């Protein structure tokens, strides 16, 4: 078991770009908390780290410019999404999170086949790569949009399906 | 240095005694009134180390200035309590006993 990690129900996000996922604001606040504390000190939102932490502790204490601070915290960063059972490496993929209202993770349609995910109640885990190195590995090697062909067969694995095919065919 | 290999071997009685910081002589654990560890039993700070960082069992020494000092009144080294994860003890058997792994894992290595 591991820190900086969460899970939730997944939901389709049609508007996402292939390299993006939808991450609920509250999850992102907890997943990124030390970064957010720092960034809050770096602005006037709290004198120091510990004041900021007490502020985020109570939900009715949470201000508005903290959501803006969070958005600066996640800029260009990726999270890892995982759906168990993790049968091949594409059971884990890196995504740039887009913050959303709501409590569901928003997953891009074209990665569902590789995750073997659909939307009849599946849940997924999310994880934060911390260091510059882990973050670099995740953005170069594990990004959804850099993993398009199957390593088993060489054939496309991110590819049109269901409605996408249906409309294009029509 | 840097770890490059990991060896595993039989431990001799003498090797085992070198690991041990004390023989556990009593089947006691903690005192039923004070909830503190009984002397010479399975939780004894005298053997396995202090429960509180840099503080003997009775209280005579309570700061990091004493370090490695073994208190005379209670016998407890003054170091970090984390050492209660690392310090072995031993039981000196009155008669030798076979290690069942070398008996029942067939074919028996002893046999």
């Amino acid at each position: 078991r591991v820190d900086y990690s969460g899970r939730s129900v997944i939901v389709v996000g049609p508007q996402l770009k292939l390299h993006q996922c939808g991450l609920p604001k509250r999850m992102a606040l907890e997943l990124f908390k030390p970064f957010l504390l720092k960034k809050m000190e770096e602005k006037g939102i709290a004198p120091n780290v510990k004041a900021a932490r007490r502020m985020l502790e109570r939900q009715r204490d949470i201000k508005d410019e903290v959501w803006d601070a969070l958005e600066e915290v996640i800029h260009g960063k990726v999270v890892l999404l995982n759906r168990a059972p993790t049968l091949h490496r594409l059971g884990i993929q890196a995504f740039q999170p887009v913050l959303v209202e709501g409590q569901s993770i928003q997953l891009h349609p074209l990665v569902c086949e590789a995750f073997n995910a659909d939307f009849d109640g599946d849940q997924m885990a999310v994880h934060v790569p911390l260091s510059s190195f882990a973050q670099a590995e995740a953005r170069i090697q594990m990004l959804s949009a850099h993993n398009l062909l199957s390593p088993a067969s060489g054939e496309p694995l991110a590819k049109p399906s269901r409605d996408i095919i249906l409309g294009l065919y029509y | 240095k840097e770890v490059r290999k990991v060896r595993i071997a039989l431990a001799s009685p003498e090797k085992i005694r070198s690991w041990s910081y004390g023989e556990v002589e009593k089947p006691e654990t903690i005192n039923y009134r004070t909830l503190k560890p009984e002397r010479d039993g399975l939780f004894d700070e005298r053997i396995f180390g202090p429960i509180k960082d840099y503080e003997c069992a009775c209280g005579k020494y309570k700061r990091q200035r004493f370090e490695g000092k073994v208190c005379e009144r209670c016998g407890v080294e003054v170091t970090k309590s984390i050492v209660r994860r690392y310090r072995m003890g031993h039981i000196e058997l009155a008669t030798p006993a076979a290690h069942i792994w070398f008996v029942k894992d067939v074919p028996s290595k002893i046999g």
Partner: protein
């Protein structure tokens, strides 16, 4: 509104009492209503009769038992976490054999849990169900040897834990072996011990050729029964002294002691029927006049030889036939644990009979009480009651497990036990079973099925005499069913005469076309093939079984809604389900309503008596869904017996109301209903459709410490007045306050553990000159993601009819209610197995809409139908469209329901209502409707040349309409299926599942993050997640997962500090769990050494473990 119903099968009998399998079984076990002297020797009475008398001298004997009244009623037991139970007394008498002295007393034995009216139990406050178990029946079986094709194994099987399994076999050397407790010895020996001579064995067995020769051993016949008996005791107990009375005692306890061997009544009956013999009792032999007398062994051998040779009338047994598998109900399961507790009690009695100088003095009840408690709390058939909705509870009471004590072990259960056997028909539902690894091992009783007194499942059939169907119905076991030709329930009848030349029937499961003359019985109803849940799926005949299974199972998980509705298409079972599950109050007799309240209804009955009915209001179920009853009558109303007085949860005017009827369009929608996701309208939230009430319970204790007492108080150090704003004088949050994550529900202070402050703290104190307080804040706070309105507090403090476990001074419990609106990530489903998570909530102006301006409610994707093959949901929608415009509902019974032509008639009427309204209001056909008719003509859906109206009507009779896109005003380019569908909101709410962690508690031994939302846990990055990272070559990401993020202590501390300082994370070091592994190997006498490249030790313990 009007209910129109379809179908031509008239059910001769109603469904039986749907919980009788629970209620009657337990009533049989307790015999509480029966005067003691009239009791049968069954149930706990039979337990007593097996235990007593207790001999050796002294004797302690049983006269009778008695069950008193429960000390606390059911609600009080739920409130105070008590067990609802009755005190058990036994009248016992101690006789000293030589003195003749007799002492008699009624001794108190503890308490026995009582079954509530609905068939469940209240164990320590929580409702529980004892789930019935299925097992192989006791008896005598004959089975093919899987090794030797022409040989057979005979198996004698008693009741579970009531004797050993005995096998007889014909060995390749020809001698007939007996195996018991894994001991292969020649059966001839035991036959001799029984008193059989070679003369009797020759004359009784010689018919079967050479087989009897492998039984003839002269060295055995040359010994009298005593010498054979001692010989058997030696080859059964190596090293045990072959004492004569000890050998008698052992073999008697193995084969003849009724207190140790028991075939049961079922094993008795089946052994008798199979072997064609009569049994005196229920054991394999008796001890009569100083010698053993055979009952079963010779008949079994007779049969085994006859089967081996080939003589007619001898067949192998199908062990999965439901004549050979029986149900252990709660009464029997409990009686068995009661019998074990009583055996331990008797051992204690004999113990005190040795050491001592009264019945009470001799009897220590504790073991008995321990066994019952152990049964009702930690058994695998004792299950937390599912009462998500009332159907959930009803269904739970009718479940059947092949697991549990004395049953199968999953991961081992093969394909045979999980199959639907032909004999399941009318007995065990063929669709309702789990989808995971338990598939086929947990099942549901069929709607009309009944467990008979021996435990076999019976189903009802109507008698047919010369083509006439009578009203005699006969409940049969599968053995009896196999005798007859049984016609299908849809056989056409003119009055009572079979009006057909060719009749579909079954003979031993086999479908067969038969004349009326040949028909002996006829099914009562299609209903009898399926579980209650499966009987609630309209148009089941059009749904592939795999998705019908899902619709079945998901009705269990429907949440009760504040505006719940019954379906517009019902099967006709909805009222009976509400009734049998006690999901409503009904009038006890004819009468008149005197008083009506949110809280209570007072009715004046014909007797003149004034009966008052309190209504349960916003009570908390086991699952947190809301149990409340709402009155459905008014003052002065005249009620007949059985009329509805109040609706419970998921009840609408007495009909099962598991969700809402919503207006549905079947079309893709911009990716938002991709791969089973669902799009809904904001209108649904606006009118509180799919809104549910949920109640959470929080609990806090204040205990005595060695450091001073915990106190429940408002005076909490360092908190503002804002933090205490809604805390009462005593420090408990007030009723009606809104609590959010972080807010205090119960203030509590605890004395601090003796700590010398770190020098930094000493200096900071001096700088501010403030004494550190002596207690710290240990209050109960609302956890992350929870909250609502406080609706109850309970306060139990010691010194107040209140006594708590040792050392706790007070317990406080706070009840918090939330109204849950449908939101993105919540799960919806229909009864045909269509299920999906809400992905998008659109404002009303974005919804597809009808020409008259009516927007639809939910948008389901057509890609969910073809590969699922569950077309019932399409017919439901078609009929829903009709009902929408006619203001009517339908009952369409399964396999006997609405057909396409009748649905088309109704759609023609509904069209006239939907379109003639327009033609009257002064409007013609729209230009966009003309464009869609042009496309429809090209699709083949409408006849070219007809007028706009006639073509629109053709579409409508196909259940399709012109639909406008709310974003554009342009029509969808083809007509779309639209109609009413019944959709439920399931108890899988994202509000409960979303969870994240940065840091938090770690485990004691491993120093790894704890698991579980309540522990503020971390996610498991298991073996396979690691493989994925390895396969990407993401080496540093993985090293973080294994060190800085889990159990690298300095690493995790330093990474947190570096991040909050804006630095980069430091390099990891050794994980603690590897240190733990090294120490655990050192305890195994293994020296595990980390070396460097020069083979020199490296200390991973930094000197802290080297002297």
């Amino acid at each position: 509104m009007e209910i129109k119903r379809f179908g031509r099968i008239r059910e001769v009998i109603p469904l039986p009492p749907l919980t009788e399998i629970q209620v009657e079984s337990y009533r049989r076990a307790l015999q509480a209503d029966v005067p003691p002297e009239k009791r049968e020797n069954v149930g706990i009475q039979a337990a007593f009769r097996e235990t007593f008398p207790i001999e050796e001298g002294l004797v302690l004997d049983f006269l009778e038992y008695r069950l008193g009244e429960p000390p606390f009623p059911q609600d009080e037991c739920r409130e105070k976490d008590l067990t609802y139970q009755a005190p058990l007394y036994a009248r016992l008498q101690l006789i000293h054999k030589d003195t003749g002295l007799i002492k008699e007393d009624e001794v108190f034995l503890g308490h026995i849990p009582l079954m509530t009216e609905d068939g469940s139990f209240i164990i320590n406050g929580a409702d529980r169900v004892i789930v019935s178990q299925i097992h192989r029946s006791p008896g005598v079986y004959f089975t093919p040897d899987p090794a030797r094709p022409g040989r057979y194994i005979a198996s004698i099987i008693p009741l579970p834990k009531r004797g050993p399994w005995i096998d007889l076999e014909v060995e390749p050397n020809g001698v007939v072996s007996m195996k018991v407790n894994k001991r292969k010895f020649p059966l001839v020996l035991l036959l001799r011990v029984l008193g059989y001579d070679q003369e009797t064995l020759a004359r009784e067995l010689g018919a079967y050729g050479e087989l009897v020769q492998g039984l003839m051993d002269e060295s055995v016949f040359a010994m009298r029964p005593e010498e054979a008996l001692i010989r058997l005791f030696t080859l059964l107990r190596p090293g045990d002294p072959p004492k004569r009375d000890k050998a008698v005692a052992y073999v008697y306890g193995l084969i003849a002691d009724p207190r140790r061997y028991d075939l049961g009544e079922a094993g008795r009956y089946k052994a008798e029927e199979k072997l064609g013999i009569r049994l005196s009792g229920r054991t394999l032999a008796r001890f009569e006049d100083g010698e053993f007398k055979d009952e079963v062994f010779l008949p079994t051998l007779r049969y085994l030889f006859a089967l081996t040779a080939g003589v007619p009338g001898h067949e192998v047994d199908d062990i999965d036939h439901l004549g050979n598998r029986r149900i252990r109900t709660v009464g029997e399961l409990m009686t068995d644990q009661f019998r074990v507790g009583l055996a331990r009690l008797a051992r204690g009695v004999r113990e005190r009979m040795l050491m001592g100088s009264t019945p009470a003095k001799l009897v220590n009840s504790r073991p008995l009480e321990a066994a019952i408690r152990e049964f009702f709390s930690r058994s695998q058939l004792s299950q937390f009651k599912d009462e998500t909705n009332p159907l959930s509870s009803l269904r739970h009471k009718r479940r059947i497990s092949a697991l549990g004590p004395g049953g199968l072990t999953r991961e081992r259960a093969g394909f045979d036990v999980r199959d639907v056997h032909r004999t399941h028909y009318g007995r065990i539902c063929p669709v309702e079973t789990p989808e995971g690894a338990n598939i086929g091992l947990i099942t549901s009783l069929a709607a009309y099925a009944r467990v008979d007194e021996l435990g076999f499942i019976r189903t009802p059939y109507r008698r047919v005499v010369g083509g006439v169907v009578t009203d005699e119905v006969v409940y049969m076991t599968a053995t009896e069913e196999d005798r007859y030709t049984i016609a299908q329930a849809n056989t056409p009848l003119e009055g009572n005469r079979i009006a057909a030349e060719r009749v579909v029937a079954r003979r031993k499961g086999e479908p067969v076309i038969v004349s009326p003359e040949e028909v002996e019985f006829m099914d009562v109803s299609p209903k009898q093939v399926f579980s209650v849940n499966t009987n609630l799926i309209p148009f089941l005949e059009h749904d592939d079984a795999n998705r019908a299974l899902m619709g079945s199972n998901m009705q269990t998980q429907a949440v009760p809604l504040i505006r719940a509705q019954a379906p517009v298409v019902m099967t006709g079972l909805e009222e009976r389900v509400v009734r049998d599950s006690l999901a409503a109050l009904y009038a006890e007799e004819d009468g008149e309503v005197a008083k009506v309240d949110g809280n209570r209804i007072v009715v004046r009955y014909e007797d003149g008596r004034l009966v008052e009915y309190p209504l349960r209001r916003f009570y908390r179920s086991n699952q947190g869904t809301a149990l409340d009853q709402r009155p459905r009558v008014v003052v002065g109303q005249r009620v007949r017996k059985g009329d509805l007085l109040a609706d419970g949860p998921a009840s609408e005017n007495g009909f099962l109301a598991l969700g809402q009827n919503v207006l549905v369009a079947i079309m893709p929608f911009d990716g938002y209903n991709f791969e089973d996701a669902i799009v809904i309208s904001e209108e649904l939230l606006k009118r509180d459709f799919y809104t549910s009430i949920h109640i959470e319970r929080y609990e806090i204790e204040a205990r005595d410490t060695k450091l001073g007492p915990e106190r429940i108080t408002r005076d909490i150090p360092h908190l503002s007045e804002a933090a205490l704003r809604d805390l009462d004088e005593e420090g408990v949050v007030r009723i009606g306050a809104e609590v959010k994550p972080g807010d205090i529900l119960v203030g509590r202070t605890s004395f601090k553990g003796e700590s010398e402050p770190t020098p930094e703290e000493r200096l900071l104190r001096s700088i501010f000159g403030e004494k550190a307080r002596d207690v710290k804040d240990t209050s109960l706070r609302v956890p992350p993601g929870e909250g609502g309105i406080v609706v109850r507090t309970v306060r139990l403090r010691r010194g107040d009819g209140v006594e708590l476990k040792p050392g706790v001074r007070e317990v406080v419990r706070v009840y918090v209610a939330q109204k849950r609106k449908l939101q993105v990530g919540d799960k919806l489903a229909n009864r045909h197995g269509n299920k999906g998570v809400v992905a998008k909530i659109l404002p009303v102006e974005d919804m597809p809409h009808l020409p008259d301006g009516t927007p639809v409610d939910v948008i389901l994707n057509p890609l969910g139908v073809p590969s699922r093959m569950n077309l019932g949901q399409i017919l439901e929608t078609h009929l829903g469209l009709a009902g929408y415009f006619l203001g009517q509902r339908y009952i369409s019974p399964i396999f006997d329901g609405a057909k396409e032509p009748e649905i088309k008639e109704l759609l023609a009427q509904a069209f006239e209502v939907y379109f003639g309204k327009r033609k009257g209001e002064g409007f013609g056909v729209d230009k966009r409707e003309v464009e869609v008719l042009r496309r429809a003509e090209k699709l083949g859906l409408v006849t070219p040349g007809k007028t706009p109206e006639e073509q629109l009507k053709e579409l409508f009779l196909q259940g399709k309409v012109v639909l406008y896109d709310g974003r554009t005003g342009e029509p969808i380019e083809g007509p779309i299926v639209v109609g009413q569908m019944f959709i439920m909101k399931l108890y899988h709410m994202v509000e409960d599942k979303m969870h994240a962690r940065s840091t938090g508690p770690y485990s004691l031994i491993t120093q790894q993050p704890l698991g579980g939302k309540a522990q503020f846990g971390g996610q498991r990055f298991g073996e396979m997640e690691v493989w994925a990272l390895e396969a990407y070559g993401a080496a540093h990401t993985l090293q973080e997962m294994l060190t800085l993020k889990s159990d690298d202590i300095e690493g995790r501390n330093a990474a947190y500090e570096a991040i909050i300082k804006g630095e980069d994370v430091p390099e990891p070091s050794v994980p603690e769990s590897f240190r733990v592994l090294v120490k655990e190997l050192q305890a195994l006498a293994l020296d595990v050494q980390t070396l460097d490249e020069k083979d020199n030790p490296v200390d991973i313990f930094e000197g802290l473990a080297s002297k």
